[PDB]
Design a protein around this ligand. Structure first.
Ligand SMILES: [Co+2]
Length: 331
């Protein structure tokens, strides 16, 4: 239907180039490791235990492979603990394909001091553009590992001036290389705005996935976003009633409405799970346990798909969402 148009490079995973057909069932938004900005300053008591993270992540990778998932797109921002070399370790040890990102978190929670400083002194947008293009076409941090996607994020109330520097640089790398763009939206807002801004800047809608769209429960919101021709991702499936996220029941209700309206070619599914936290492992208060109970990477394969199927979603629609769409968007 709507295929990518323009410059295009082969999907780049942490262990190298992969043919679109080799992508297979994919979870489009996950984090093997993740650390909120500041975690590095807690290194004395929250050090990274490499051998333990490697064993724990390889184990999650193997379970994903057991479900038939061959690929995970790691959406971790550059300022949130991103580590391509660790990701490659996990990929080499298990055979699970992993793509990583190039990009910064949103203004509300990212490490924003650096680039705001750069922006006050000069043209931050060019510096950001140059970083993204380098990481996507040459490699990250001298490692030879390239980012297979650009990650963008924005705040609840507006795409801030700080965030726009990134949207503009990303659009330019998108136009030049064809690399896909996945995003974060805050609390169910700005999806239409991100799609509008990115398309108006010349980025290809067929190579754009607006994320955290499950954060809004009014289907008209998803529909206005989808009008732009972009894909949307229900990507925090399993995280319930936390930070006001809705329940999975709410998400599936919107999702089956959209599936019923013919939107399969534009819907992607993920959990935004964190397999291993950077910093001190988080202590989840008693009360919060249920909100995170289904928040792990086997939740869609074991619970959501069977649920969609029994509700009448067809095998073909599930295939389109988990295999067709990722094949087109990232390959
Ligand atoms: Co995420």
């Amino acid at each position: 239907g709507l295929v990518p148009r323009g410059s295009h490079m082969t999907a780049q995973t942490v262990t190298g180039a992969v043919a679109a057909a080799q992508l297979g069932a994919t979870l489009p938004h996950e984090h093997v490791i993740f650390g909120y900005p500041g975690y590095a300053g807690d290194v004395t008591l929250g050090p990274f235990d490499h051998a333990a993270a490697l064993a724990s992540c390889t184990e999650t990778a193997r379970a994903l492979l057991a479900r038939g998932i061959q690929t995970v797109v790691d959406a971790t921002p550059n300022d949130c603990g991103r580590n391509p070399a660790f990701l490659r370790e996990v990929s080499e040890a298990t055979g699970l394909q992993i793509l990583c990102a190039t990009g910064f978190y949103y203004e509300g929670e990212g490490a924003t001091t650096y680039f705001k400083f750069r922006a006050s002194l000069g043209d931050a947008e060019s510096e950001i553009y140059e970083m993204m293009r380098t990481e996507v076409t040459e490699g990250i941090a001298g490692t030879g590992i390239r980012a297979g996607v650009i990650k963008l994020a924005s705040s609840r109330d507006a795409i801030t001036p700080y965030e726009q520097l990134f949207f503009r640089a990303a659009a330019r790398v998108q136009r030049e290389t064809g690399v896909p763009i996945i995003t974060h939206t805050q609390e169910g807002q700005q999806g239409p705005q991100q799609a509008e801004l990115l398309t108006s800047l010349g980025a290809d809608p067929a190579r754009i996935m607006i994320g955290h769209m499950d954060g809004n429960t009014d289907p008209a919101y998803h529909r206005e976003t989808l009008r732009h021709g972009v894909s949307i991702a229900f990507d925090a499936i399993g995280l319930q009633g936390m930070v006001g996220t809705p329940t999975d029941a709410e998400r599936l209700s919107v999702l089956t409405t959209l599936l019923g309206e013919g939107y399969a070619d534009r819907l992607l599914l993920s959990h935004d799970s964190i397999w291993h936290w950077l910093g001190r492992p988080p202590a989840i208060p008693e009360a919060a346990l249920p909100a995170v109970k289904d928040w792990h990477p086997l939740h869609i394969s074991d619970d959501i798909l069977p649920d969609l199927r029994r509700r009448g979603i067809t095998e073909e629609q599930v295939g389109q969402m988990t295999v067709g769409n990722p094949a087109r968007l990232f390959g």
